[PDB]
């Protein structure tokens, strides 16, 4: 029933969303066995969508270059580089119709439609302008249905004098438009892991992308197939979203370790219950130790002593009592689900609504008022409409959350 219509748009988005289906290992036959194949029939319900021709890269490559192929979107020849207005007002509003023609001739497919978990990386107008559009285009059409998004925030590092003033015009609605619920990654945090903790003298996208997938899957398919009891893709948005202007989830795997005779507690059962709850292992990197979490979901993976897990998960819930709002009676729930990944023997998966992501927000906030307002560079969007504001009413929004969030962070 949790018929999930997986969306995957944008070049530097498909690349991640792709090798995700690489992580979803159960192939096309040849395999609990009481499977919960949510989405569509035995061909990824995925609906890849790119502005340029990036739907091919490793997309239609070595991994699984067969994502329902005869549906893929490109339109045939186009562009849309790093111009939001582009792919959300222009060279995409061409494509939309195309997509909003194949997702529907895909969404439907009898079984009750879960919603749409749309993948992409905020601040890159190709598929983070096309997609942020899709949303407001899948929305106000499928109100009822719950929408999801695994948006990727442009590392504070700063690529492009534009890979930044970008997305700040997204969390201007990617939180007031269909997005009842959306996890969020911070490339910053990703370098830092392949550096500040895990090894790697440099993170090949074949590095600063691994976790990106062994983290989604660690929240996707689980809380989905058999394991302990069940779960769907929506009772969540009601236990993890205390408010309308919701809050962005701060995902966070755990057993990352590094090579070596990984004896760092050698994945001790209680380790998972520490190897995870820290910014040294969070996918948004924002000192969780800042504000409390209005809620938090856990997802222990790899069959092991369920005792220890509730003995440990409450532990810290009984530990940093300084970081759990404490006006939301039982702001936590564990989840244990049998069948493990491909190399951990044990593994967890953070999913907390911690008011710490605040940082990962007032960032893409003190760059706009501190640039696109401090003066300009916006004289690159007006080309495609966008005259004047639309960058200030957009600044009079995502900037808000500072306050909003700061109101419970306390």
């Amino acid at each position: 029933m949790r018929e999930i219509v997986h969306i995957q748009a944008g070049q530097c988005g498909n690349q991640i969303g792709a090798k995700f289906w690489e992580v979803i290992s159960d192939e096309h036959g040849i395999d609990v066995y009481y499977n919960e194949a949510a989405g569509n029939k035995y061909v990824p319900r995925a609906i890849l969508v790119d502005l340029e021709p990036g739907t091919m890269d490793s997309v239609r490559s070595g991994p699984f270059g067969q994502i329902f192929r005869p549906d893929n979107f490109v339109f045939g020849q186009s562009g849309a580089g790093n111009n939001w207005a582009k792919g959300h007002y222009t060279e995409g509003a061409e494509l939309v119709d195309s997509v909003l023609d194949v997702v529907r001739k895909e969404s439907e497919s009898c079984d009750c439609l879960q919603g749409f978990q749309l993948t992409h990386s905020l601040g890159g107008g190709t598929g983070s302008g096309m997609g942020t559009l899709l949303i407001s285009k899948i929305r106000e059409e499928y109100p009822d249905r719950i929408m999801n998004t695994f948006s990727v925030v442009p590392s504070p590092k700063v690529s492009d004098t534009v890979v930044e003033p970008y997305n700040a015009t997204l969390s201007v609605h990617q939180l007031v438009e269909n997005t009842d619920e959306t996890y969020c990654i911070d490339n910053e945090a990703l370098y830092d892991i392949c550096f500040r903790t895990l090894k790697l003298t440099t993170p090949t996208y074949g590095d600063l992308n691994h976790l990106v997938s062994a983290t989604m899957s660690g929240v996707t398919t689980c809380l989905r197939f058999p394991g302990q009891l069940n779960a769907d893709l929506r009772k969540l948005a009601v236990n993890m979203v205390p408010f309308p202007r919701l809050h962005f989830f701060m995902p966070g795997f755990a057993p990352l370790t590094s090579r070596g005779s990984q004896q760092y507690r050698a994945l001790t059962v209680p380790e998972l219950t520490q190897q995870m709850f820290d910014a040294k292992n969070m996918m948004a990197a924002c000192d969780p130790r800042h504000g409390r979490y209005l809620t938090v979901a856990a997802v222990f993976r790899g069959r092991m002593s369920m005792k220890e897990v509730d003995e440990q998960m409450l532990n810290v819930q009984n530990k940093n009592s300084s970081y759990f709002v404490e006006w939301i009676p039982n702001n936590v729930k564990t989840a244990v689900c049998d069948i493990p990944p491909r190399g951990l023997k044990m593994s967890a998966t953070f999913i907390g609504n911690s008011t710490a992501i605040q940082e990962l927000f007032k960032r893409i906030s003190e760059q706009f008022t501190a640039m696109f307002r401090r003066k300009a560079f916006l004289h690159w969007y007006t080309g495609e409409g966008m005259d004047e504001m639309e960058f200030t009413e957009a600044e009079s929004n995502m900037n808000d959350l500072v306050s909003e969030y700061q109101q419970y962070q306390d």
Binding site: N239, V241, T295, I328
Partner: protein, 423 residues
Amino acid sequence: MRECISIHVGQAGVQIGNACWELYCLEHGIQPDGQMPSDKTIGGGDDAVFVDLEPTVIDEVRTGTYRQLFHPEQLITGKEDAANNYARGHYTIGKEIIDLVLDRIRKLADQCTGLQGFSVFHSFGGGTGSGFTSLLMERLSVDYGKKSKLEFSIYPAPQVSTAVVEPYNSILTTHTTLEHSDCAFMVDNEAIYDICRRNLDIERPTYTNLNRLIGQIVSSITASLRFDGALNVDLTEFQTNLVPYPRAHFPLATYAPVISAEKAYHEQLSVAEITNACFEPANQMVKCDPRHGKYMACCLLYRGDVVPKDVNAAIATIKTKRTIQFVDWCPTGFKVGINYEPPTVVPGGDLAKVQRAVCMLSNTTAIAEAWARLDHKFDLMYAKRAFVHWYVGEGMEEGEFSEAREDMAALEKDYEEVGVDSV
């Protein structure tokens, strides 16, 4: 003869109920009766309405089945994966599958002359079976007013399963009372995930473990007093004894001879070795503490052949203890009922058969305690912001609460208008 109807709405209920007609294996109501309504008139003249909102948990009966099937037709079901926003299942969705259920019921509750009765197996704290029944009854009470209603609503577990959960109870009780139900047996999962872990060992008390135990108790009530035999009872005469004022008072349940199999049953427990554990806290349902509250009733239910002359032997011993204590306006006594019928246990599921079953029923003004704390994990958030916007963006409200917090407040209010003074 005169059969009361039962309707279990909601996984927690479906699962429970599901494991009760399994316990209701106590005698004739099994063999070649499949579609054979004929013969004797009881245990179910066709041993019945299963309405869940999640076509699946309630699907381990027909499609895929589950070791059995009563009558493919009496198990209403939808598609809407779930809900979990009370309104979301009490209004919106509910409003859809509420006329196939109310129709089916009537077209069941209206078979073979003389109705009288409705045992609604519940479970609150999670829409569907928390919000859809809040309506079921609002309906039934509209077309069976003259009929009584029981409800074994399963109380949430401090092991806290879900947030927004606490708050259902409240926007639930508020009308799932006066507007229906004369009696209602609060379970409180907390209890069992504790007792079925202590008196029954068991490490991680699986739902069935907890169902093979809330299921026994239910027999030692409904069943325990719903098949003539010898000393008997009538549903009409269930409140008359157990139900002080219209304020639907929730009687507290307590089973006593609980023994696994792997440990010593001690050959037996004197018919009084039991009726004290039967008075031991940890053997109750609602994790209360009648240690601070004047019973307004109290009536034992022994089961499996027992001679009165030995019963009072403890009803005595106890009396000798300055504790307990009643109120005033009630003859500080009992109503003790004995069943000769032996206590039915199942293959590893019930764990060991007893010689003597004992399960009483008293409504101590102390349940109010473990019953308003559930009002704290609500006055808490649901007063200072809370997930209130879902019970909106999926239905009406904005006082769906509060408005429905006073009467559910006036409760611990009433529960003292029968405990603070000599009136």
